[PDB]
Design a protein around this ligand. Sequence first.
Ligand SMILES: O=P(O)(O)O[C@H]1O[C@H](CO)[C@@H](O)[C@H]1O
Ligand SMILES: O=P(O)(O)O[C@H]1O[C@H](CO)[C@@H](O)[C@H]1O
Ligand SMILES: O=P(O)(O)O[C@H]1O[C@H](CO)[C@@H](O)[C@H]1O
Ligand SMILES: O=P(O)(O)O[C@H]1O[C@H](CO)[C@@H](O)[C@H]1O
Ligand SMILES: O=P(O)(O)O[C@H]1O[C@H](CO)[C@@H](O)[C@H]1O
Ligand SMILES: O=P(O)(O)O[C@H]1O[C@H](CO)[C@@H](O)[C@H]1O
Ligand SMILES: O=c1cc[nH]c(=O)[nH]1
Ligand SMILES: O=c1cc[nH]c(=O)[nH]1
Ligand SMILES: O=c1cc[nH]c(=O)[nH]1
Ligand SMILES: O=c1cc[nH]c(=O)[nH]1
Ligand SMILES: O=c1cc[nH]c(=O)[nH]1
Ligand SMILES: O=c1cc[nH]c(=O)[nH]1
Ligand SMILES: [K+]
Ligand SMILES: [K+]
Ligand SMILES: [K+]
Lengths: 250, 250, 250, 250, 250, 250
Amino acid sequence: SDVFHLGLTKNDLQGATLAIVPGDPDRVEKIAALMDKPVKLASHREFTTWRAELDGKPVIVCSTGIGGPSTSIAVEELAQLGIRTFLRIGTTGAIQPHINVGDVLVTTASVRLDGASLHFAPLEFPAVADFECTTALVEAAKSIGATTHVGVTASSDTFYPGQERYDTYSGRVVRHFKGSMEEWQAMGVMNYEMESATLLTMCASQGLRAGMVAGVIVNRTQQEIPNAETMKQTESHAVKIVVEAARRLL
Amino acid sequence: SDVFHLGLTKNDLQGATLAIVPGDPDRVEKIAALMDKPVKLASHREFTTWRAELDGKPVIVCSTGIGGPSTSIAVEELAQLGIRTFLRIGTTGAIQPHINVGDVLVTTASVRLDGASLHFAPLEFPAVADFECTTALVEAAKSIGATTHVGVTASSDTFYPGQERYDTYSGRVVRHFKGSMEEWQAMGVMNYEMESATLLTMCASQGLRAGMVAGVIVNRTQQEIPNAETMKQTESHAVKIVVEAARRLL
Amino acid sequence: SDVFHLGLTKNDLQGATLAIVPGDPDRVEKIAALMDKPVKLASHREFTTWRAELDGKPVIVCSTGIGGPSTSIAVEELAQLGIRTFLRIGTTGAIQPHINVGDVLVTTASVRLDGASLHFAPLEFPAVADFECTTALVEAAKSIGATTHVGVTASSDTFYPGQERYDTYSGRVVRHFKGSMEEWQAMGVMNYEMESATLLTMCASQGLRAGMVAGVIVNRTQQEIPNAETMKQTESHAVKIVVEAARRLL
Amino acid sequence: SDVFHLGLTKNDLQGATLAIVPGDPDRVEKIAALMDKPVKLASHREFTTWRAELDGKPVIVCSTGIGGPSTSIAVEELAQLGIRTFLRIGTTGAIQPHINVGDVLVTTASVRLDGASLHFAPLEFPAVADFECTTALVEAAKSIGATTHVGVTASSDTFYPGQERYDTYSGRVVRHFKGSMEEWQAMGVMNYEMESATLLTMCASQGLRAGMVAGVIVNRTQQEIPNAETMKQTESHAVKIVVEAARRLL
Amino acid sequence: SDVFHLGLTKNDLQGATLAIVPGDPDRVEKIAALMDKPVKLASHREFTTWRAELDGKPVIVCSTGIGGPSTSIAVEELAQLGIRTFLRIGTTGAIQPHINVGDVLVTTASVRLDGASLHFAPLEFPAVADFECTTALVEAAKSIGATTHVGVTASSDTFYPGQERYDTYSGRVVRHFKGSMEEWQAMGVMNYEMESATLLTMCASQGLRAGMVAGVIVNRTQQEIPNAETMKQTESHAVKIVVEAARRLL
Amino acid sequence: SDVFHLGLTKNDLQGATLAIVPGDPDRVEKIAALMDKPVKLASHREFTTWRAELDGKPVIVCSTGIGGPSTSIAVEELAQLGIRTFLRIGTTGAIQPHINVGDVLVTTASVRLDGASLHFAPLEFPAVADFECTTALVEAAKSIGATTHVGVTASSDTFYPGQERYDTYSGRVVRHFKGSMEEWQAMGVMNYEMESATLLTMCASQGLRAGMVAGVIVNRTQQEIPNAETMKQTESHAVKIVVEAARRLL
Ligand SMILES: O=P(O)(O)O[C@H]1O[C@H](CO)[C@@H](O)[C@H]1O
Ligand SMILES: O=P(O)(O)O[C@H]1O[C@H](CO)[C@@H](O)[C@H]1O
Ligand SMILES: O=P(O)(O)O[C@H]1O[C@H](CO)[C@@H](O)[C@H]1O
Ligand SMILES: O=P(O)(O)O[C@H]1O[C@H](CO)[C@@H](O)[C@H]1O
Ligand SMILES: O=P(O)(O)O[C@H]1O[C@H](CO)[C@@H](O)[C@H]1O
Ligand SMILES: O=P(O)(O)O[C@H]1O[C@H](CO)[C@@H](O)[C@H]1O
Ligand SMILES: O=c1cc[nH]c(=O)[nH]1
Ligand SMILES: O=c1cc[nH]c(=O)[nH]1
Ligand SMILES: O=c1cc[nH]c(=O)[nH]1
Ligand SMILES: O=c1cc[nH]c(=O)[nH]1
Ligand SMILES: O=c1cc[nH]c(=O)[nH]1
Ligand SMILES: O=c1cc[nH]c(=O)[nH]1
Ligand SMILES: [K+]
Ligand SMILES: [K+]
Ligand SMILES: [K+]
């Protein structure tokens, strides 16, 4: 292996320069399966990597795991191997009433509620997505007619308090985050996720291109019993979109 | 007057919902002159406002003056009058060797080296531009074949120390900003300006659309002796681009 | 021109070392008119400069425009031209019940709710006024028997949220400033303005003397329909005071 | 499943109240294998969970994945299931010359270079380990005669810049972390890891007991070429020590 | 004198390497009186120093006065004289209902609500106690059967607002500390004191060992008329404990 | 006693409303001795209090001890007893070449390098002295012809690192303070002391008047070997000046 965690060699990528990075290792195969000649390259810790072919060009799919820390490792090591474009496809919880479960959200920039982004640039630096990737993702979503929303995303190092959830063990939320969701809502923030802040910041400040898209599997403002079928259908929609976006970025 | 500083009334705008906001009062007439039926509406403090017609639609041009403070007043009061889209057109100093004087820069997001943006959202919130406005500005630039660069901009509350200039009275730069330009350069920041951080943040967090474009009148990394001719020629192309962008946002 | 923005040359000042710096360009002539041989030197952007004579000594009057950013430019460039003493005369909104519209407030130091001051010294540095200037302003006010208050001023980069105004477009105030006015009131802060923090900090940390005086045109704690005549009368009072203070600083 | 990510139910734990939480999913089975009746309960994302019996008491082993984010999810959900004591066992890079590869380090408290801990308590709160767990870990290490060091650990949201590594793609380290390792060294910090800050803080501030132990697989101050043999042998001893510590905490 | 404030010479300590540091000068003699051959060495400002013998070894007792500032001076100068181990014995106000007046609290680490600790290490560094000292203090308390609590302590630079007391002259508490006590309580913090944050941080980051123990003289959650006799009895208990702990650290 | 630490009752002050607060308990008697009918009221911890008569009016002299913490206790409790004006008289180390040992420094405002001031107002609030007290101190100094300097003072919670001293046990200074003295010097800061930031801030934000004066006993920029004679002679003149200032504040 040429890198410390991914268990991959430069040769494994066969010259690939673009990688699709889902948060869940389980989603990696599903994404690769949409492309040609999918092959599993490795699996270590939360990092599962597959290689596939898109329009004759080798493409990488590598899970980041949950959070900026593992994400920073995956991006850095993939970059060490030649990857220059990263497209994240994940799941998210919307916080706006007009956004529905099943909708696809494209992040223009993220509210930095993470710690890793700070290891690449001070807080004042914007966790903004690459313009070409965002455009490709937007066009891709439009190509299949998906209900899409484009805007700001709150990226939290936490699934519970940072996203102001009280249905927890302690049932408390530290002062800094009390009433934080309502604030983000008033500011027009579309959703909560846990890797975009780190991904976009580290890429934007290091000459790497990054895009971010996620399917809504829950809406914090509208109570409704989760539909597993709907979730699977949503993830499928987003996956088709991230792959189609990758085609435009080759 | 219906607002505290601009000396304007709701009717003066005749239903206008988009405003072009240059930093210099002197540039307002030049911008309006490119459109139809240009009329001067008011002039108070650093706020000079003209109204014009673009493709049959009333449009506003209002100077913000230098800095987020005066900018925040202009944006807020214009918003109080119905304006929902703001396109800033200004001048800027590039800090990348590959960017030349005369080039046009479109800001995707800004490094917040200002204080006003904090009066609308905490530092972690991204000073990101609206996707539609950015796109319009990019297309507009392409329409006339202008050499264009799209990326991050460092927006400073200061023209001198915040932009790490030492050719000053004290000849010193506070510790926080010592070696700051080199850092931004390494992070791929394209330029320094003084209003985008405030403009983009306050708009992005209040449901208002904002775009940002500026012409390069100097390159901090290139010796070169300033030329008024090309400097005014650069302002010209930028003005045309912001107007053409506005057409696509009507 | 020897400076980048003011459009002034060293020779224009005829050796002047003191400048009166109002926020509004329109007030510059009114101030100069009180002195001898008033002459307009230049007018660019929000920077309008006049020269006059006080007790046989050349004196400068230069508008800073609204906000620390434009203020920092004006002060720096005037300093580049030889100015060593700066006296700001502005308008302000009082936040104490015992202070009345028409009263004159002399700032001893300011609460730094700006961003520019940070470009000269870290937040812990006090935005304190020069002792000689403050004294001169206090004596000057007493010379004409004006009702005067001496104390701390909250200097905001914003006219609306930073001064906790809710009568706005969004009708919201970012968390950091929610309930901030009541806090300042409890701390004895006299008023809100938008340039003293930047002015005092940059001067105090660079060997330049600065004083700050403003006339009350509104009291946030006492509702009362604004009287234009009263405002004009107040500005006149403050202007006479800043000029008289300048005489004692020659 | 009774929790959102772990894919576990309350009954799966059979009343277990203590969990051993390694960072790597692969290490979970190795840890459980040292105890009685080891059974795999689930595997989802980076969360692999096994149940085993220690001195007749049910015990849980659950991987956290790399980073405070995934760690915060695992701890919270395990707590939702009844777990009240958490013992982390991991790998680490020493930064002190007197510490050797193979040595075992017990963390008394951690330098918070993470973002998740802030989602539970402000920075001033100490990321301190529970006294009983620390004691148990120390005794456990002594029981097998392992060379042990007790002290402070720097817990980073990043494997590269936060640990001031320059052998990277960008080859640069953000200003905040430039010369940071030397500073920690001078302060007596023993090592760098990536989960203790989050683990200790969230536990200490929510009435949960937490301990932290790790085996040294590299020493940043000593040249030496990595050895898989001793690296796996080190993991072995650490695993035994954390299990033995758990026995004393039942 | 070999130091600037303590008025002590290296020779005065007769090779002592451990010092007991109470906050009150008046308590110094009481502590020394429990040991052999107690002798007063000096008294300057709030620094009163006595020397005594414990199991044949010379030991120092030196008051720090109230607060991290005076504490930092005492520790530094004593260290300059050879002291390497510091055990603080003080008084404290408990904030947990289950803790009673008369109980003894051993601090594992402290919430840094002080300013001095920052002069030795950034806020992210833990104000953790030395493991050996904490252990000795715990054992010592157990040796005489004192009701003991081990945990986190909130160390404030202030006796009133920082400990959220409203029974004051202003009757107000700055925003940062409003509702702060309830937050600490929810986080399991045991008590409020005013020197541990500074003591533990400066020692932990400079290779010096420090322990912290205090007797409860009030419980903020349980109203009860103070008993002077009880207080004297409590201080006596804690003193006997700190001395006994010192014996185990020789 | 009517207060928790000072061991004083309301009646002890006989209606006094002004207090002189030196840092050293030993200096209290010296100050009182200059006035009429001096009487010792109490002595507890570092708080020594005397009462005296100045021009027929009862005046209080109370030591604060070293540091904002003990200072905040003394000021608060004295305020609880009726004191409304506080004049600090201390010793200080100058950092400007033009200031000589023996000179007297009057503080207009202080750089807040303390933690206690934050317990009364956020960092942006200025630690400014009352205008009347400052004036009185300045006039008082002039009345006896003392070489006086008026300006900003750096008030540190620490005598060593915060004042960037390297002649210490560790011989190191935390990053935050490395090169800090040179920075303050360039900003025109006159000296280093340890109580003004806390004193001025808590007074200015609570409607209490405060003044600050200190005698130079060392100049960090000038070699010179310390002299007890001139050091005590300097304390003498400063004490007289603070007393004379008090007369003008009655
Ligand atoms: O489904 P992924 O891609 O993991 O993305 C979302 O899912 C996780 C939270 O359940 C976090 O990673 C969040 O960003
Ligand atoms: O030319 P404008 O539009 O003013 O923009 C630039 O010019 C000014 C500095 O000279 C600042 O306003 C900066 O943002
Ligand atoms: O009237 P000037 O001098 O501009 O001062 C006040 O007026 C403006 C706000 O209306 C800000 O500049 C504020 O400081
Ligand atoms: O081996 P684990 O337990 O994962 O611990 C260490 O290993 C990872 C870095 O390689 C991070 O998780 C770090 O904390
Ligand atoms: O009794 P000491 O040891 O002084 O400790 C406590 O007592 C003082 C407050 O009354 C502060 O020093 C606090 O830490
Ligand atoms: O001599 P005092 O009044 O104590 O003032 C100075 O002396 C002490 C330092 O030696 C600190 O209190 C400092 O402020
Ligand atoms: O609510 C949610 C759902 C998925 N992922 C998140 O980060 N948050
Ligand atoms: O260098 C420059 C030029 C124009 N505008 C800026 O803000 N900076
Ligand atoms: O309320 C007011 C009035 C004038 N100027 C300000 O800054 N605020
Ligand atoms: O150097 C290292 C090795 C293991 N784990 C870390 O966090 N850092
Ligand atoms: O309540 C209290 C009592 C003693 N010491 C403190 O710091 N606080
Ligand atoms: O150098 C010095 C001397 C006296 N007091 C201080 O705070 N510093
Ligand atoms: K302006
Ligand atoms: K992970
Ligand atoms: K003290």
